[PDB]
Design an enzyme around this catalytic site. Structure first.
Site, PDB file in Angstrom:
ATOM      1  N   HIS A  62     -17.140  -5.847  -9.749  1.00  0.00           N
ATOM      2  CA  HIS A  62     -18.614  -5.752 -10.366  1.00  0.00           C
ATOM      3  C   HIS A  62     -19.469  -5.390  -9.213  1.00  0.00           C
ATOM      4  O   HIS A  62     -19.025  -5.730  -7.954  1.00  0.00           O
ATOM      5  CB  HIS A  62     -18.978  -6.991 -10.949  1.00  0.00           C
ATOM      6  N   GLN A 113     -17.220 -16.753 -14.030  1.00  0.00           N
ATOM      7  CA  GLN A 113     -16.123 -16.951 -12.992  1.00  0.00           C
ATOM      8  C   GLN A 113     -16.772 -17.294 -11.593  1.00  0.00           C
ATOM      9  O   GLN A 113     -18.025 -16.540 -11.309  1.00  0.00           O
ATOM     10  CB  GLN A 113     -15.710 -15.570 -13.048  1.00  0.00           C
TER      11      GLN A 113
END
Length: 147
Positions: free
Chosen positions: A141, A115
């Site tokens: 994250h 990503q």
């Protein structure tokens, strides 16, 4: 003057200058200081109700809001930075990804596999460095570059 993504900013709280990285969301008091083909990274993912798949090994239906996920992420960063808990320990226990079983390790990767916000943060970290909150469709994250 300053590596990729790093800029200088004024702390509202303290009035001292700090340094922030708009690619990794890292922030620190200290001045930071041939892009590799591959990097190796670990991560800790906190999902929320708008994540692409609001489910994990921890919780079949994730219901927390994105705001609540970011508060969790901020809390984990505080615990890691303080040395109260290490990254691997929190990833193992709390990451909403099965990478948790390998202390958050995703292994080695190049550009064009992950990503894009994940990739960009990973490649702007130097070995040993940790991101702030990194936002993707999977969730939020914390990334640690290990190689």
């Amino acid at each position: 003057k300053l590596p990729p993504g790093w800029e200088k900013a004024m702390s509202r709280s303290s009035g001292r200058v700090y340094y922030f990285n708009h690619i990794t969301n890292a922030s620190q008091w200290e001045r930071p200081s041939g892009e590799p083909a591959r990097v190796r990274c670990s991560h800790l993912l906190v999902k929320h109700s708008q994540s692409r798949r609001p489910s994990s090994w921890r919780q079949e239906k994730i219901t927390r809001t994105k705001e609540e996920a970011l508060e969790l992420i901020n809390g984990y960063i505080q615990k890691i930075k303080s040395g109260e808990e290490d990254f691997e320990s929190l990833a193992s226990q709390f990451s909403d990804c099965s990478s948790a079983k390998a202390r958050g390790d995703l292994g080695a990767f190049s550009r064009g596999q992950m990503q894009k916000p994940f990739e960009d943060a990973s490649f702007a970290l130097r070995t040993g460095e940790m991101s702030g909150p990194v936002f993707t469709d999977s969730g939020i994250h914390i990334i640690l570059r290990t190689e």
